[PDB]
Curated annotation (Swiss-Prot):
GO terms for molecular function: cadherin binding; chromatin binding; dynein intermediate chain binding; G protein activity; GDP binding; GTP binding; GTPase activity; importin-alpha family protein binding. It is an enzyme of class 3 (hydrolase). The record marks 69 as: Essential for GTP hydrolysis. There is a cross-link at residues 71, 152 (Glycyl lysine isopeptide (Lys-Gly) (interchain with G-Cter in SUMO2)). The lineage of its organism: Eukaryota, Metazoa, Chordata, Craniata, Vertebrata. Changing residue 24 to L: Has low binding affinity for GTP and GDP. Almost completely abolishes interaction with BIRC5. One of its GO terms (cellular component) is nuclear pore. This is GTP-binding nuclear protein Ran. The modification Phosphothreonine is found at residue 24. Monomer. Interacts with RANGAP1, which promotes RAN-mediated GTP hydrolysis. Interacts with KPNB1. Interaction with KPNB1 inhibits RANGAP1-mediated stimulation of GTPase activity. Interacts with RCC1 which promotes the exchange of RAN-bound GDP by GTP. Interaction with KPNB1 inhibits RCC1-mediated exchange of RAN-bound GDP by GTP. Interacts (GTP-bound form) with TNPO1; the interaction is direct. Interacts (GTP-bound form) with TNPO3; the interaction is direct. Interacts with KPNB1 and with TNPO1; both inhibit RAN GTPase activity. Acetylation by KAT5 at Lys-134 is increased during mitosis, impairs RANGRF binding and enhances RCC1 binding. Acetylation at Lys-37 enhances the association with nuclear export components. Deacetylation of Lys-37 by SIRT7 regulates the nuclear export of NF-kappa-B subunit RELA/p65. There is a cross-link at residue 71 (Glycyl lysine isopeptide (Lys-Gly) (interchain with G-Cter in ubiquitin)). Changing residue 76 to E: Probable loss of interaction with NUTF2. Loss of transport to the nucleus.
Length: 216
């Protein structure tokens, strides 16, 4: 990455979540990933190359999307294997899905170790966000950053990717210089709601407690 003249850098990205998280929708947003869509029969997993143009240069994230396996149940180790990158998403409305996050994390860690993990809450587009910053504690407990994204609205699409890339490179000052072509959002996020959400998160972070909640 720091060296130049190297072939374009690809990171194998593993996306983990429950059905109804919109995780696949998140992928659908990235036009190039759709255009270059590949499938692996052996794993039963779709491959979607997602290219993001950074200050360092274009970074391809080879996104692995299980073909419905999550709906079936737990994921085969092969899917997790070689998870250079990991993003786990939970439905903000679904407490059950939040409860599932630790489980998915456990499987991921079991297969692969020393790998950056990005934890995101999805579908914030729904006003009834049952899982809130105060309830969000697992992230702190694992020392993994929380990200607020809404695939349906294409809210914060770049955020998880940019931070993931920053982790991988080790470059805090990394910026997405250019944005890859994205399919139109299903809905438009209300700016006021988004601002409120962000402010609330900031206040929670500002709050002088060892964790989001004194759960322990």
């Amino acid at each position: 990455m720091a060296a130049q003249g190297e072939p374009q850098v690809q990171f194998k990205l593993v996306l983990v979540g429950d059905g109804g998280t919109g995780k696949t929708t998140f992928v659908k947003r990235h036009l190039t990933g759709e255009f270059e869509k590949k499938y692996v029969a052996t794993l039963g997993v779709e491959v979607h190359p997602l290219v993001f143009h950074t200050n360092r240069g274009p970074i391809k994230f080879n996104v692995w999307d299980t073909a419905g396996q999550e709906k079936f149940g737990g994921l085969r180790d092969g899917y997790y294997i070689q998870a250079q990158c990991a993003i786990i998403m939970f439905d903000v409305t679904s407490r059950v899905t939040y409860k599932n996050v630790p489980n998915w994390h456990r499987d991921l860690v079991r297969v692969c170790e020393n790998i950056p993990i990005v934890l995101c809450g999805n579908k914030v587009d729904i006003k009834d966000r049952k899982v809130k910053a105060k309830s969000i504690v697992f992230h702190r407990k694992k020392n993994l950053q929380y990200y607020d994204i809404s695939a349906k609205s294409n809210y914060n699409f770049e955020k998880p990717f940019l931070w993931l890339a920053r982790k991988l490179i080790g470059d805090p000052n990394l910026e997405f210089v250019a944005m890859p072509a994205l399919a139109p959002p299903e809905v438009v996020m209300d700016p006021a709601l988004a601002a409120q959400y962000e402010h609330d998160l900031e206040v929670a972070q500002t709050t002088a407690l060892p964790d989001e909640d004194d759960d322990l």
